[PDB]
Amino acid sequence: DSSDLLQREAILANELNILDNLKTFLNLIKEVKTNLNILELENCYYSLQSLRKKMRNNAAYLKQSFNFQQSISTYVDTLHLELVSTLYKILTNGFWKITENSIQFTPTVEWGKDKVHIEYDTFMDFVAQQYFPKGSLDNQAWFILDMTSADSQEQVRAKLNTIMKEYMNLSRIVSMIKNSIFISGKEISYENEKNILVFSKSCVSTVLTSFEAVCDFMLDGLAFRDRKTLSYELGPLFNTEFTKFVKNNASIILESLDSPLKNLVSVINNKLTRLVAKSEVTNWTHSGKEIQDLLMNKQLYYNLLLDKVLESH
């Protein structure tokens, strides 16, 4: 009974220490949650940074009984998922909306009930820094690594992985464009007002006009970031396939001196040239000389005919 009395006095002696400790944790969690509600999502990451610092450093923390301690560490986990999920929704469904035959981009959004202004470059600046600072996804980073619930961690990875794969490396956009340009019966269109690139199903004119849609979208539809990424990835192919197509349809494009397909071919040519300059890449070039010449000099048409004939002659 004096042991019961002792224990009771031990417990009470540690009470104010426990509540003070709890009070701190709640203040740090309040921080995370405040920032998340007011969509200060850059800050919110640093709020989680301090919190995971304090949790890593509290030696009492891991000594708390299983279920109680686990429930706090899981709460904070789902704040990890909440911040990333909010990031992913603003990105994959605010700045970008990519259906299976549309690609839409907007450099600005007014998000949530309180309608807060967010700018794509500012946003993508901190997102890159915090989650992909090496240029790829940091799988050894505390954000992923400190999480202690399997399902919420898998989900955080998945979301961050696709943000890299599809909204940084633009992989799906790159393949949608790749699978349509210069392919007969695959139409593409560009509505500059709503800034959407629409893929359809449906001649030499239609192919050129739809490749011009792609061009216009990259020239005028994108942030510097993504024009550069797509141009890096597609530029080589743009080059090979524009000219191959023009040469293959010479007799319809070049057979007359002032054929109306020449205006369109000219325009796409100067646009491809503006693209290289504008995207600032170095993996491909486009002076546009070869096409300017071909369109201007009838003899070059005759040369193609001559050349083609001599292959199987």
UniProtKB/Swiss-Prot annotation:
It is found in: Endoplasmic reticulum membrane. Residues 1-164 are annotated as: Interaction with TIP20. It comes from the Eukaryota. Component of a peripheral membrane protein complex consisting of DSL1, SEC39/DSL3 and TIP20. Bound to a SNARE complex consisting of UFE1, USE1, SEC20 and SEC22 or YKT6 through direct interaction of TIP20 with SEC20. Binds the coatomer complex through direct interaction with RET2/COPD and RET1/COPA. Binds TIP20 and SEC39/DSL3. Required for protein transport between the Golgi and the endoplasmic reticulum. May tether coatomer-coated retrograde transport vesicles to the ER membrane through interaction with coatomer as well as the SNARE complex. May contribute to the stabilization of the SNARE complex. Present with 8970 molecules/cell in log phase SD medium. This is Protein transport protein DSL1. It comes from Saccharomyces cerevisiae (strain ATCC 204508 / S288c) (Baker's yeast). The gene is DSL1. The chain holds residues 37 to 355 of 754 of the full protein.
